Symmetry: D2
Subunit: 115 residues, 4 copies
Amino acid sequence: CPLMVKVLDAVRGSPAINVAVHVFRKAADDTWEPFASGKTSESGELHGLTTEEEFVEGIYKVEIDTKSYWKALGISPFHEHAEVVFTANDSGPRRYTIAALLSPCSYSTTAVVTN
Amino acid sequence: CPLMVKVLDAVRGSPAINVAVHVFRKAADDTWEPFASGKTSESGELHGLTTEEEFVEGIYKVEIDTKSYWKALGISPFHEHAEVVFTANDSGPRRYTIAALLSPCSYSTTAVVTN
Amino acid sequence: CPLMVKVLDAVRGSPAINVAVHVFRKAADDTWEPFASGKTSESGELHGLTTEEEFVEGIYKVEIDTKSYWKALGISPFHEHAEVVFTANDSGPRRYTIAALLSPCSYSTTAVVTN
Amino acid sequence: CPLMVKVLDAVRGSPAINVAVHVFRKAADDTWEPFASGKTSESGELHGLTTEEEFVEGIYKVEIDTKSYWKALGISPFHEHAEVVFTANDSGPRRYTIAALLSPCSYSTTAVVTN
């Protein structure tokens, strides 16, 4: 799979488990079209979102439902969700890992792109 | 001002200057309505986006145009922009500082909220 | 003041108040000599640590006592403290802002340096 | 191995490869005693630092030579190194992953502790 998502919890120092993730692809009319979704596993990872054939160049949005995650833990969060928007390119063969670190009032996201 | 945005550059270790910021509010019909916009100053801060009167309860989106910022420095970054989505003033009026820390392939954002 | 420290809390989305900060300078004999210390104020800032005259070239260490901060909130954190080590004024005098963002199992620190 | 280190590069959006890492254990006299060292691999990971038998409760310091890393890339960095200091506990069986995200003027570190 060319696309992977990894989510970490900065408060408990653990993978963020069972977090909902929705991926969208930008359509010709500039609206967001559902592309793939899933929930993070006990490793805080989400594999098998898509394949090489379907993952063509374009603009993608990864939406992480952080609000429901903090609500489950009884912690009041600031953000409705975390959004990561990027362009996928074919500048050679590549695997994309979208990593996110979550706190109730802060989040960080990083792209790890390897060949 | 109830809403302030502060942007830093993690590569140069300086404020991020002349960064475009657009703010939207979710309308009754569920679409994003333009709320305000501006550019960061020499100190990486954006003040005067709105007033107490105008800044009513609702869901807001702060979009920071990170791509244009990195491209003007010769760097092709990963993200199209950084988006911060939150509910504001749902327990009464508050002052919000949205801070963002930028790297070409990573960003973090934090909220500082005071009564 | 040439040296300023700013500390934020990622869990509460507020400045980190009453956090102890100790600053050390590397001496000729390679040991850490106490340089200054203080606690953050209501705004999470620590000013007046030193003056231009006293803040000469050298390697400095800023130690932020994060453990005591989290323990006073009922949280047992991961780190003993956050340490920031840097060479200062090796290309002439500068003004340094050391910012830190705290979570129980994570922290980030950034430097803002201006001429 | 109960202790692992993972290092990421926020500028290039890749693992930080061939980064030197030194681990120390706090001795009864409060000095830092060398414990283990190595260089990160092509995955930005460092495995096999120690074993269950030798990794007893105590205070450990992980030092990441970030300065040499940025120097190799021709980017001027702020910090001499990144330091992570923590207490290892036997609160049940556990594996520790110390993750770090690097920019020239900023770094973040997180502990991912799983069972």
